[PDB]
Amino acid sequence: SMILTQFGPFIESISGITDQSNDVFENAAKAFSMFTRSDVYKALDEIPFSEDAMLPIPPTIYTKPSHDSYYYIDALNRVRRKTYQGPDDVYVPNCSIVELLEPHETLTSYGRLSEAIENRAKDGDSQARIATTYGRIAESQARQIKAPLEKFVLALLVAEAGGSLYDPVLQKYDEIPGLSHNCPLWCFREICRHISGPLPDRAPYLYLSAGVFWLMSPRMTSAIPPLLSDLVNLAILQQTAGLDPSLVRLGVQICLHAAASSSYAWFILKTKSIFPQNTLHSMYESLEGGYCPNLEWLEPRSDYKFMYMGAMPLSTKYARSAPSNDKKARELGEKYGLSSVVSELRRRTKTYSKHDFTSVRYIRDAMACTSGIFLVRTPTETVLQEYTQSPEIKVPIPQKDWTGPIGEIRILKDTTSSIARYLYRTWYLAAARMAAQPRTWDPLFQAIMRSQYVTARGGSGATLRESLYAINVSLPDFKGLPVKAATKIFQAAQLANLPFSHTSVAILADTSMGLRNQVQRRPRSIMPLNVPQQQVSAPHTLTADYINYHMNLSTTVIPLGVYASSPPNQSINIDISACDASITWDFFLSVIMAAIHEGVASSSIGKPFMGVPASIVNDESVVGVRAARPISGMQNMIQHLSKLYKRGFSYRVNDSFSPGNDFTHMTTTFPSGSTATSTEHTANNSTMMETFLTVWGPEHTDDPDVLRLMKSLTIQRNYVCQGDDGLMIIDGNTAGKVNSETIQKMLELISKYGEEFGWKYDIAYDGTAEYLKLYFIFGCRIPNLSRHPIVGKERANSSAEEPWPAILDQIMGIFFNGVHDGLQWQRWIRYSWALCCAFSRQRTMTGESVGYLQYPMWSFVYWGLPLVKVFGSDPWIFSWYMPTGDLGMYSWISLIRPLMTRWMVANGYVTDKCSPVFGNADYRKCFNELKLYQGYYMAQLPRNPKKSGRAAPREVREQFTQALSDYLMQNPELKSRVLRGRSEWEKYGAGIIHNPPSLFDVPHKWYQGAQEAATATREELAEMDETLMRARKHSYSSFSKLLEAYLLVKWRMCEAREPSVDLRLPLCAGIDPLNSDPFLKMVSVGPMLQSTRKYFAQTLFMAKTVSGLDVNAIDSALLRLRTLGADKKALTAQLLMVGLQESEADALAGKIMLQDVNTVQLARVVNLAVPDTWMSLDFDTMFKHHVKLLPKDGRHLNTDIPPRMGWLRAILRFLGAGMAMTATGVAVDIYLEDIHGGGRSLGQRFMTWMRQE
Amino acid sequence: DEADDATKKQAKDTEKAKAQVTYSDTGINNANELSRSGNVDNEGGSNQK
Amino acid sequence: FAHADSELLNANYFGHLLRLKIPYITEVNLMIRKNREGGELFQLVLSYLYKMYATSAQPKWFGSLLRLLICPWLHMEKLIGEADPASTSAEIGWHVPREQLDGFIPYVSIRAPRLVIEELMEKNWGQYHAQVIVTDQLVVGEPRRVSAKAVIKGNHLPVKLISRFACFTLTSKYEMGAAYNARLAFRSD
């Protein structure tokens, strides 16, 4: 009622009752900024609840002991925590935050970590350092949320106070239960009330952007800020993902038991798999009916092309013959005292016996309820726990099987009984066939190899420059630059003019750390490498790329698992645990470096690689002879890289969360962020699975069934792997599904294969497929809602976060992750309304002058949030598969344009001047009043702007850019061809675009790419404020040239496309006849069915699509110079500024003058793009067959296009398909009505805009 | 099962995980072979009692 | 000294690693010794298990480490075998300013001629710092010095910052309570 007194018009404005207007938008936004936490906590007291949300809370959360017994000091003064229950108990305790605290100076009830304890810890006291470690890690756990916490639940109450809505297609009220029913708001309300108590201030903590302020209640524990994020996550999902009460109540019970435990994040780790194991891993186990897709492989088994050959029914034979799950899951529930939850989940799972929509929705509802916090620990725990792992090799390579040394490499013998000879054979032949290619000695290929690894995310030369000072080489420091010294670009410009022998001992330096938190996992510790170490590992990446692209070729996502999950085709999921740590010099890296150093010997015998000269090392490879043998370039790089692989890696660890912790220690783990990590892991996974199936399997079996199975399986036909993991497809034979006992015996034989040479296969076999963390059962896609939380964002550093226009940038990503998942749009997109309205006003704090900021609603619709009612239209009228930007804006205003023009004369805005789009009305007095024009151009304004540019002196700036040009370009044929292309382009083609994509942009581009993370403080933020104020105070007179160019054309929709797939088939979780728009659109157009990573690769015209610069911009520049005139030498020179041999550039320019471009590629002249919401759906057949020109009424003479400038057909394809997809309901065949100007006038206006881009 | 036990003993005597010289699962169909057991007596009946 | 270099690789060992190999047959040297642990056959089997356990890395011969230990000091004995110990000796280590119940811990000792030490004095020894922990268990040695502990924090000391020309000791102990946060400095006569 109290909320209703101020939000009367707005709650009904977004619920489809009245239309959305700028007036209630701005009044509501005034209200959205005007709040207090007491004003939010009147609300949750105000709403009465129906007791189905009520359940007991144990009292052991609020009383938790002191934290002094949990931490101790190592013998090297390392602060590490004491483990009580297993070595995985290394996380944040849940206890006693009120005592190490000092109150704020004007917020007398909120407080902060004490300054005295910080000073005594900077002295070096024991207990002070322990206390500040616990305090800072509690702050870092409490920080991991996007916006402040109450703002989300406020937007929840504003959106969801409207009650149940009216579905326009289904013509009924939805039975999403009201806000008075849900468990998590009740638990949130009661925990906040009991934590406040007698205090007048009611919030448990306050979120400033740097760190949080607490509340001085003696019953406060540190488990509360992740718990409230989980509880508001379950409350925000239940309203809009169509949950039941019961699974939400079970998830809330598990969160309460998580707070009751001795450590919150540790329990969330150890119970991360109760919900999949009882429902998804144990599904149906006896069935009688359903429908499943009948996919069929297209015979070349490297191309990954598919065919949907219809639906097919099910029978009793296709019941789950996977082994049991009862004893292990009951033990897992029994060990932690969660037996009621696992018994309830199993009782409800055993009911279902028919594969249809409701069972898949139940699986999605059970997967959605796992906790969505980010697990966090101090970085010293990460480094001292996960890096101490090391592989055990039960059958090593015997010491007789190696020859003597060649330099510091021994060769594996030919007469070797070990299994490593197949790895040696594979990597030998791969190295020889790599080095025999004439592609590898292309200087453009060398230049793109050097351009590959010097990325902006490059760090840790932080002891390299000290070690290079320790070997007495003179490095320029470039004093006077606004670069930071840590970037890899600055480091490569240091190492530009130095011989390889001087930087040879630069290889054995260390590396610092980079931390990334993950959903329900241990925190990922990414790590860089320095410049000579990433240079010297070039055969190690080239040979693995040749494996993954030419020899074994597993794969460089969804329809693969839709095939592999189809019920006659079982699948085995293969995960390799600790796959970085389990490759060392003991087995792998020894035989890898031996095979590469031996395989590259022939075809590169004397010639050197980039920068690295030839050398000589002596050999003793035959026992009788000893000599010195000349060494080529790539062999020499293997010689230098082998020292580093033998020694192991030291890591320079510095955390900000605990003072006094500073250490290095050696490790043998493979580095995560190298230039050859994922390709190397795929290559080794593929090679070991191959030599498994072809040798080691048949050597250790007696069963003809298992032997007959392993003869038919091969990695070329039945095994797909990415990174470390993958699945293995088992085809269904003639008699049905393959017998599960033989598959079980082969599985327990794969585990014995792994325990020989170091690996530890994590193998799950349950009749489902996991692949790149996407879970598919019976050919049905299931989104993991718990993987994408709405509330939390990953923060690793303790540095303060971004300014205002980025927290509003992230929410379009929130809405799009809602789009990719299956949500009831009736309350989800209305929640997106209330939230994005709530984030719109800011209250800047500039000196003595009061200024306010607000984006209009039309900006939010320009970014991709489709409207509910426009100007007297039907409620719930638009779809969220609309394009973002001008194409979208055009389409949904064109769907309503007559009714919108007729609404213009309601409250009459009448003008004599008759326009072809509007006629009776004027649009200025309407649209500049409603800030549609201002919101259109204000959405067009760039977010997160910054420019430091701290007065670079010209001499040392020029020396930095010249050294960067010298490092990127060594070979002067590249310089000659790019100066030749520049000169010919300024001769012929310059003038029409005045903006070239050139290679000399890249030294400048990397120069400012160093200062893309300078985060200067005040002046450009105030400059952003001034630009937004002047762009608000303006009054435009029209749209842009693109949209006014679009407004001339018209279309017409009818005759309602035939269905692509069956309607009864469950294809995706969360779309069904209950979710009318996305499921109905899915059945209309059909799903993707293509690999869609080779489709976009076929689109781009570049010979390998590798430049280091924006290949979309090169293809756009070539097409824009094609369509406007511009004699062929302009295109030759434009290609030569990217750099070619002057001949293939000329040939490709003469080609691109003439051939017909594909439809999707011609977006580049007009800067369109397919939205990512259309990636799940098919589009290509809709473009080729369901948006066509030359309508059913015949010619209209505003339908003809000349044979010259026929690209307008392909852009009108995008136009009609956007007009199809913006409408709710099915996709509809649309033909081309009048365009009012002709192809002449449309081509002239398009060329007129393409004069100035 | 006696051929199975001999195959396992051959595997333990060659100290592999699988006996290379195997006595069971051969190509010869030998579904009529019978080694003596305690089921049948000397007269020709069963030994349930 | 240890065995089977993966004993130094599995356990994260900081410091240099020198895989070495004796010029003699080890396996007959196993079974000659008397009163060792268990039977000598068991010692030889256990030695084979260490050798199977280790790696495939080509070690070295043992000669380089002893050449490094012994042979530089003979050139210094030929060079400065007749000058004075006061002006040709040096000493470096950690140094804490205040005085409670001056503090100095030996870190490395240096022999060098006069010009080399008078070049060594003005180098920037004040860059590196650590934490220094002094306990109160004095031991059998004659001067008043007590055992302590020191844990280096920043970067490590490079050998170019000693010299190419001076001759220093490689390995030493830390002998001089709470933490002190000391910084190291040079001292000589």
Side-chain angles (χ1 to χ4, degrees):
Chain A
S1 66
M2 183 274 291
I3 301 99
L4 280 75
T5 55
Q6 291 91 21
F7 294 99
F10 183 73
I11 294 170
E12 60 93 21
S13 178
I14 55 175
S15 68
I17 295 171
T18 192
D19 57 351
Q20 292 177 356
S21 178
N22 198 3
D23 195 4
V24 66
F25 181 81
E26 291 181 352
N27 292 121
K30 299 292 184 292
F32 283 128
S33 67
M34 188 273 292
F35 287 113
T36 308
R37 302 280 75 79
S38 66
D39 292 331
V40 189
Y41 289 155
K42 298 293 182 182
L44 296 173
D45 196 4
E46 184 178 3
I47 303 300
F49 291 156
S50 299
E51 194 270 332
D52 58 353
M54 293 179 182
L55 80 162
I57 297 169
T60 62
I61 290 98
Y62 294 101
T63 63
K64 296 297 287 183
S66 296
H67 64 89
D68 57 353
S69 67
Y70 292 163
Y71 292 170
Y72 65 94
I73 300 171
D74 198 356
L76 277 298
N77 296 114
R78 289 190 295 267
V79 178
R80 63 181 295 164
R81 71 182 303 277
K82 187 176 178 182
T83 66
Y84 291 165
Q85 295 177 357
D88 206 1
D89 188 2
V90 280
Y91 290 105
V92 185
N94 49 3
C95 59
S96 293
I97 202 163
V98 69
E99 70 272 16
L100 47 86
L101 194 148
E102 184 177 2
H104 191 270
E105 68 273 16
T106 189
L107 295 174
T108 62
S109 295
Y110 291 162
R112 190 180 63 189
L113 177 62
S114 178
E115 182 67 28
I117 298 171
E118 292 180 354
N119 291 318
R120 294 292 299 275
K122 288 173 71 175
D123 193 3
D125 194 1
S126 169
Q127 294 179 356
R129 189 176 64 184
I130 291 169
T132 189
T133 298
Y134 181 73
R136 292 182 182 179
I137 196 61
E139 295 287 322
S140 179
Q141 187 178 5
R143 190 177 174 180
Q144 300 291 322
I145 55 173
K146 293 181 184 292
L149 185 64
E150 299 296 326
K151 198 168 281 286
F152 293 104
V153 68
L154 189 144
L156 189 147
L157 200 144
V158 172
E160 306 282 317
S164 297
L165 291 172
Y166 183 77
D167 194 354
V169 175
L170 272 68
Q171 298 289 322
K172 66 183 290 294
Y173 290 164
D174 55 351
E175 200 184 356
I176 297 170
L179 191 145
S180 67
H181 295 285
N182 54 0
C183 176
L185 289 181
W186 182 71
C187 294
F188 183 78
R189 194 269 307 273
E190 187 181 2
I191 289 166
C192 289
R193 184 179 65 239
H194 188 273
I195 201 70
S196 296
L199 274 299
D201 289 332
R202 302 288 296 169
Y205 64 95
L206 183 63
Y207 181 78
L208 191 142
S209 64
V212 306
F213 292 99
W214 294 96
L215 180 65
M216 285 81 85
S217 298
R219 62 180 68 87
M220 181 69 76
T221 63
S222 65
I224 303 299
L227 181 142
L228 297 179
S229 66
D230 284 330
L231 268 294
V232 73
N233 197 1
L234 294 176
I236 197 174
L237 287 175
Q238 182 176 0
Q239 295 297 112
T240 56
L243 275 298
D244 58 350
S246 62
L247 297 176
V248 176
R249 290 173 66 85
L250 293 174
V252 170
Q253 287 177 0
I254 293 174
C255 293
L256 292 175
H257 291 294
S261 66
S262 297
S263 296
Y264 184 80
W266 181 68
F267 185 85
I268 297 300
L269 190 145
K270 295 293 183 70
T271 58
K272 70 181 288 294
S273 67
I274 295 174
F275 288 163
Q277 186 178 1
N278 293 315
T279 61
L280 190 144
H281 295 281
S282 300
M283 198 66 205
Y284 294 154
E285 67 183 1
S286 66
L287 62 90
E288 69 270 14
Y291 292 100
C292 64
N294 190 1
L295 290 180
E296 196 272 334
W297 183 266
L298 270 300
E299 185 63 30
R301 292 187 182 269
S302 298
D303 292 331
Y304 293 95
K305 298 296 290 182
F306 287 151
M307 188 57 65
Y308 180 73
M309 291 185 178
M312 60 174 286
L314 296 176
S315 67
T316 308
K317 295 186 289 183
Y318 292 160
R320 184 177 180 272
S321 67
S324 67
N325 203 6
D326 297 332
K327 182 175 72 176
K328 183 62 66 68
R330 286 179 190 275
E331 192 273 332
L332 184 62
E334 182 67 29
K335 183 176 173 65
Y336 293 157
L338 277 76
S339 65
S340 65
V341 177
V342 61
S343 66
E344 179 69 26
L345 291 172
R346 188 175 300 276
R347 193 267 300 161
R348 295 180 66 193
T349 303
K350 289 174 70 175
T351 60
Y352 291 161
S353 66
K354 185 183 287 185
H355 183 72
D356 57 350
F357 294 100
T358 182
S359 65
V360 175
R361 290 177 66 86
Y362 180 75
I363 297 169
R364 192 264 302 158
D365 287 330
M367 292 300 293
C369 293
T370 316
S371 171
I373 60 164
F374 292 164
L375 303 180
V376 64
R377 60 183 177 178
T378 64
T380 182
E381 293 298 332
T382 68
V383 178
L384 291 175
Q385 190 269 331
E386 198 266 328
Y387 288 150
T388 61
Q389 291 179 356
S390 66
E392 61 180 4
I393 298 170
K394 294 182 178 65
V395 180
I397 299 171
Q399 297 294 321
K400 294 187 289 184
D401 289 332
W402 293 96
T403 63
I406 300 180
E408 294 179 357
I409 297 296
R410 297 178 70 185
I411 297 175
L412 182 62
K413 289 181 180 179
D414 195 0
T415 63
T416 301
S417 66
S418 177
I419 197 64
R421 63 181 294 165
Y422 291 98
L423 191 150
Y424 182 74
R425 190 267 308 273
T426 300
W427 290 93
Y428 182 89
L429 293 180
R433 294 178 184 176
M434 186 273 293
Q437 292 180 357
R439 191 268 309 274
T440 62
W441 295 98
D442 192 359
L444 183 61
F445 183 72
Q446 300 290 322
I448 196 59
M449 186 180 293
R450 286 179 294 175
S451 176
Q452 184 60 256
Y453 62 92
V454 51
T455 315
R457 186 180 62 83
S460 301
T463 68
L464 184 62
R465 65 186 185 273
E466 286 81 358
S467 177
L468 292 173
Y469 292 161
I471 66 162
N472 292 318
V473 68
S474 296
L475 294 174
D477 58 351
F478 291 157
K479 180 66 174 67
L481 273 299
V483 301
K484 65 179 73 67
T487 54
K488 191 179 287 292
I489 297 97
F490 181 72
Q491 186 177 4
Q494 287 181 355
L495 295 176
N497 296 113
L498 281 75
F500 182 75
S501 67
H502 295 89
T503 64
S504 66
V505 75
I507 296 172
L508 294 173
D510 61 358
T511 306
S512 69
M513 294 298 294
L515 273 301
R516 292 180 68 250
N517 291 319
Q518 296 294 321
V519 183
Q520 300 175 358
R521 295 179 66 250
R522 69 267 185 99
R524 182 177 292 170
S525 67
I526 194 67
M527 57 171 288
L529 296 176
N530 56 7
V531 177
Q533 182 174 0
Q534 291 179 358
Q535 183 178 3
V536 76
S537 66
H540 184 71
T541 184
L542 288 177
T543 307
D545 289 332
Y546 183 74
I547 287 291
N548 291 317
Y549 292 162
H550 295 284
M551 184 174 177
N552 289 320
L553 71 159
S554 68
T555 298
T556 186
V557 176
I558 57 173
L560 288 173
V562 176
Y563 180 77
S565 177
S566 178
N569 292 318
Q570 294 180 357
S571 65
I572 298 174
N573 292 317
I574 302 297
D575 296 333
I576 298 170
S577 66
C579 190
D580 292 332
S582 65
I583 53 169
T584 59
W585 184 257
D586 195 0
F587 182 78
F588 291 98
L589 275 302
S590 66
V591 189
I592 298 295
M593 291 299 109
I596 293 172
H597 186 273
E598 183 66 27
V600 79
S602 297
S603 64
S604 68
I605 187 65
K607 60 178 75 173
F609 189 71
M610 64 191 185
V612 176
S615 295
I616 186 165
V617 297
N618 54 4
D619 59 348
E620 295 84 3
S621 181
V622 178
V623 64
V625 74
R626 182 177 180 179
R629 300 294 180 88
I631 299 302
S632 67
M634 294 184 186
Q635 292 179 355
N636 197 4
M637 297 166 69
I638 300 301
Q639 294 298 112
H640 292 290
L641 184 61
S642 66
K643 299 188 284 186
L644 181 66
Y645 286 168
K646 286 169 71 173
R647 180 63 182 87
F649 293 163
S650 57
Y651 294 163
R652 179 68 180 268
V653 175
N654 289 317
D655 56 350
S656 64
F657 291 161
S658 66
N661 287 324
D662 189 357
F663 61 95
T664 63
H665 67 83
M666 296 290 166
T667 188
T668 185
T669 62
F670 186 80
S672 182
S674 177
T675 186
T677 296
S678 66
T679 64
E680 191 270 337
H681 290 93
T682 54
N684 287 323
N685 193 0
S686 179
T687 304
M688 290 295 106
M689 191 66 204
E690 183 179 1
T691 185
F692 175 78
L693 291 173
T694 193
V695 175
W696 188 82
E699 292 294 327
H700 296 283
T701 54
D702 292 331
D703 192 2
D705 292 331
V706 178
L707 184 61
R708 185 181 179 272
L709 194 147
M710 294 183 294
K711 286 179 183 177
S712 66
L713 272 292
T714 184
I715 63 159
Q716 185 67 41
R717 300 176 61 88
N718 297 115
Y719 183 75
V720 175
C721 62
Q722 291 296 106
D724 57 353
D725 61 351
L727 58 88
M728 183 179 70
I729 299 168
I730 296 171
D731 291 331
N733 58 10
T734 307
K737 296 173 74 176
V738 185
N739 192 2
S740 179
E741 295 292 328
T742 68
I743 295 169
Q744 184 61 255
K745 289 186 284 184
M746 185 184 67
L747 189 148
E748 66 185 1
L749 188 135
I750 297 168
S751 64
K752 186 177 183 292
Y753 181 71
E755 293 179 354
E756 286 182 351
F757 63 94
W759 288 354
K760 187 178 289 293
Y761 291 109
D762 289 336
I763 304 170
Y765 181 73
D766 52 347
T768 196
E770 61 88 19
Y771 181 74
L772 293 174
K773 300 287 102 177
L774 294 173
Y775 294 163
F776 296 154
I777 188 165
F778 286 175
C780 185
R781 182 175 70 86
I782 297 170
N784 191 0
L785 290 179
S786 65
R787 186 174 299 278
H788 296 285
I790 303 169
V791 179
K793 186 182 178 293
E794 191 272 333
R795 289 180 182 88
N797 291 319
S798 179
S799 65
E801 57 95 21
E802 290 86 4
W804 181 65
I807 197 168
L808 193 146
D809 191 6
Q810 299 175 4
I811 305 301
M812 295 299 107
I814 296 301
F815 181 72
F816 291 161
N817 290 319
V819 171
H820 292 291
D821 295 333
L823 299 173
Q824 291 88 20
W825 57 285
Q826 294 295 109
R827 299 170 76 92
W828 178 256
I829 197 171
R830 188 181 63 179
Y831 180 73
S832 178
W833 286 114
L835 189 67
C836 194
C837 290
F839 290 177
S840 180
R841 293 184 65 249
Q842 191 265 328
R843 194 264 306 157
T844 189
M845 59 182 75
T846 183
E848 185 64 27
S849 65
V850 177
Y852 290 160
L853 282 75
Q854 183 178 1
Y855 291 164
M857 63 179 182
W858 300 94
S859 65
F860 293 154
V861 188
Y862 181 80
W863 288 349
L865 184 61
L867 283 153
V868 179
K869 292 176 68 175
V870 276
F871 296 160
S873 66
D874 188 73
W876 296 105
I877 194 165
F878 291 155
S879 179
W880 62 95
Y881 292 162
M882 78 175 183
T884 185
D886 56 353
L887 181 62
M889 292 296 293
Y890 178 67
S891 169
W892 61 264
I893 68 171
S894 178
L895 263 71
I896 305 301
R897 191 265 310 159
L899 183 60
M900 181 265 288
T901 299
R902 290 178 62 250
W903 184 76
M904 294 292 109
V905 179
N907 298 114
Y909 294 160
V910 179
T911 297
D912 195 5
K913 298 299 293 295
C914 181
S915 66
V917 62
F918 292 157
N920 191 6
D922 56 352
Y923 58 88
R924 280 81 179 265
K925 290 178 70 68
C926 182
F927 291 165
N928 296 112
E929 192 271 331
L930 291 172
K931 309 292 288 299
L932 160 55
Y933 285 157
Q934 298 296 115
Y936 180 79
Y937 290 98
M938 186 181 290
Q940 190 177 0
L941 294 175
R943 278 84 62 196
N944 63 12
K946 185 260 296 177
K947 182 65 173 66
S948 296
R950 191 179 292 111
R954 184 177 291 171
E955 183 177 1
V956 190
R957 190 265 303 160
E958 192 272 332
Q959 291 178 357
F960 181 79
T961 59
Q962 191 270 331
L964 188 60
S965 300
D966 196 1
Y967 182 73
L968 179 62
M969 181 275 299
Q970 191 270 330
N971 209 14
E973 285 87 4
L974 194 149
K975 183 174 72 69
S976 70
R977 71 186 69 187
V978 71
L979 64 87
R980 180 71 270 169
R982 176 174 288 169
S983 177
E984 292 177 354
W985 182 70
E986 61 88 19
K987 282 171 71 174
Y988 293 99
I992 58 171
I993 62 164
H994 63 84
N995 286 315
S998 67
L999 291 177
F1000 287 172
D1001 193 4
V1002 170
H1004 293 170
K1005 181 63 65 68
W1006 289 350
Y1007 180 74
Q1008 73 244 359
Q1011 294 99 18
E1012 292 297 326
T1015 179
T1017 308
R1018 293 294 92 193
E1019 67 276 15
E1020 71 272 15
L1021 191 148
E1023 192 271 338
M1024 176 188 71
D1025 193 3
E1026 294 294 328
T1027 55
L1028 199 149
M1029 289 300 106
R1030 58 94 60 218
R1032 185 176 176 87
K1033 289 173 70 176
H1034 194 266
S1035 296
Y1036 290 94
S1037 68
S1038 178
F1039 291 105
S1040 178
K1041 291 184 185 292
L1042 273 310
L1043 187 54
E1044 293 291 330
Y1046 292 165
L1047 287 176
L1048 294 176
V1049 307
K1050 285 171 69 174
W1051 295 90
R1052 177 175 171 178
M1053 61 181 182
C1054 60
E1055 71 185 0
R1057 295 180 66 247
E1058 63 183 2
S1060 296
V1061 299
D1062 194 0
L1063 276 75
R1064 293 178 294 174
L1065 187 143
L1067 192 145
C1068 171
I1071 60 171
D1072 58 352
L1074 183 63
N1075 296 116
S1076 178
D1077 195 1
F1079 179 75
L1080 188 60
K1081 185 63 69 178
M1082 188 277 292
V1083 175
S1084 71
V1085 299
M1088 186 64 204
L1089 278 73
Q1090 193 178 2
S1091 179
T1092 196
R1093 274 75 176 175
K1094 298 292 183 182
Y1095 183 76
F1096 290 163
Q1098 185 60 256
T1099 296
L1100 275 66
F1101 280 162
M1102 188 63 73
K1104 290 179 70 66
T1105 66
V1106 286
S1107 64
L1109 71 98
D1110 202 0
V1111 186
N1112 296 323
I1114 293 101
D1115 289 331
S1116 71
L1118 296 174
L1119 291 175
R1120 288 176 70 90
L1121 268 67
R1122 193 269 308 273
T1123 59
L1124 291 172
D1127 291 330
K1128 185 257 287 178
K1129 298 285 103 178
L1131 293 177
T1132 69
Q1134 183 59 258
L1135 292 172
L1136 289 175
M1137 295 176 79
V1138 182
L1140 292 173
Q1141 298 293 123
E1142 190 180 358
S1143 185
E1144 70 278 23
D1146 187 68
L1148 196 150
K1151 179 175 73 71
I1152 201 173
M1153 289 299 289
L1154 187 56
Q1155 57 95 32
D1156 51 349
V1157 188
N1158 297 113
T1159 300
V1160 176
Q1161 190 173 3
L1162 287 173
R1164 301 289 173 83
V1165 298
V1166 70
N1167 288 320
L1168 290 174
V1170 286
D1172 57 352
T1173 63
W1174 295 354
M1175 293 300 108
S1176 67
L1177 299 177
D1178 192 2
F1179 59 93
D1180 197 5
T1181 60
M1182 182 178 68
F1183 286 114
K1184 290 183 185 295
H1185 300 292
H1186 297 283
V1187 176
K1188 67 179 72 66
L1189 284 75
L1190 279 75
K1192 63 175 68 175
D1193 293 330
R1195 195 172 73 187
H1196 293 87
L1197 282 79
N1198 297 114
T1199 58
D1200 56 350
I1201 292 168
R1204 189 178 294 275
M1205 63 182 180
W1207 58 275
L1208 280 77
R1209 292 183 291 111
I1211 275 85
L1212 269 286
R1213 298 290 178 89
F1214 289 159
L1215 199 56
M1219 186 165 174
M1221 294 298 289
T1222 51
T1224 60
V1226 299
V1228 177
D1229 287 326
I1230 299 177
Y1231 293 168
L1232 186 141
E1233 294 294 326
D1234 57 351
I1235 66 184
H1236 181 78
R1240 299 292 183 183
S1241 176
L1242 289 182
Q1244 294 296 320
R1245 186 177 291 176
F1246 289 159
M1247 290 176 185
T1248 302
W1249 181 67
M1250 290 173 70
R1251 295 293 92 194
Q1252 67 278 17
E1253 71 272 14
Chain B
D1 290 331
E2 199 175 9
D4 193 3
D5 291 331
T7 303
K8 298 293 183 183
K9 184 175 173 65
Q10 183 69 38
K12 298 299 291 295
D13 288 332
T14 58
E15 290 91 11
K16 291 180 181 178
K18 179 253 180 65
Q20 184 177 4
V21 178
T22 183
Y23 293 91
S24 66
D25 291 330
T26 186
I28 305 299
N29 192 1
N30 199 0
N32 293 122
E33 66 179 359
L34 299 176
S35 180
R36 295 176 292 167
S37 176
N39 195 3
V40 295
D41 60 354
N42 303 112
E43 187 176 2
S46 177
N47 292 118
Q48 293 180 357
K49 291 173 70 175
Chain C
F1 288 160
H3 297 161
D5 57 351
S6 61
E7 293 183 355
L8 281 302
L9 269 74
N10 294 126
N12 297 115
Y13 180 72
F14 182 75
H16 295 293
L17 191 144
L18 294 175
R19 294 178 178 90
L20 295 172
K21 180 175 71 176
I22 190 173
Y24 295 173
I25 297 171
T26 63
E27 292 86 4
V28 63
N29 189 22
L30 262 305
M31 68 186 75
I32 297 302
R33 294 180 184 271
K34 297 295 289 183
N35 297 115
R36 295 294 301 274
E37 180 65 35
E40 296 296 328
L41 294 175
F42 181 73
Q43 294 293 319
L44 178 132
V45 170
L46 177 137
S47 70
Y48 288 165
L49 265 298
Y50 289 120
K51 186 182 286 187
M52 185 178 175
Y53 180 72
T55 40
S56 66
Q58 182 69 41
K60 200 180 280 290
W61 294 99
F62 185 71
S64 73
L65 189 144
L66 287 186
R67 189 175 62 245
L68 184 64
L69 290 177
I70 298 170
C71 292
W73 292 96
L74 275 75
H75 295 284
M76 189 60 72
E77 184 179 1
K78 184 175 89 273
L79 186 61
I80 309 300
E82 292 85 4
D84 52 346
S87 295
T88 63
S89 297
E91 183 65 35
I92 298 163
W94 296 101
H95 185 272
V96 57
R98 53 87 163 161
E99 293 180 354
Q100 299 291 323
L101 76 162
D102 196 359
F104 179 72
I105 295 174
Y107 183 76
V108 61
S109 68
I110 291 179
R111 296 293 185 270
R114 182 66 178 170
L115 191 147
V116 173
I117 297 171
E118 293 295 326
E119 181 66 29
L120 288 179
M121 186 178 288
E122 69 273 16
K123 292 179 71 68
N124 289 319
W125 293 96
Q127 292 181 357
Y128 296 98
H129 64 280
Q131 294 299 110
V132 170
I133 295 95
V134 175
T135 178
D136 56 352
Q137 289 85 18
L138 73 162
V139 79
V140 72
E142 294 294 325
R144 56 176 185 89
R145 86 285 183 274
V146 66
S147 66
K149 291 181 181 179
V151 174
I152 189 165
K153 296 293 181 182
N155 292 320
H156 296 281
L157 185 63
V159 67
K160 65 98 184 178
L161 203 146
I162 298 171
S163 69
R164 180 67 183 272
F165 293 157
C167 187
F168 61 97
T169 184
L170 293 176
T171 58
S172 67
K173 291 179 71 67
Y174 293 165
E175 292 179 354
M176 179 66 76
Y180 291 103
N181 193 1
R183 297 175 71 251
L184 79 161
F186 182 76
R187 61 183 59 192
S188 66
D189 192 2

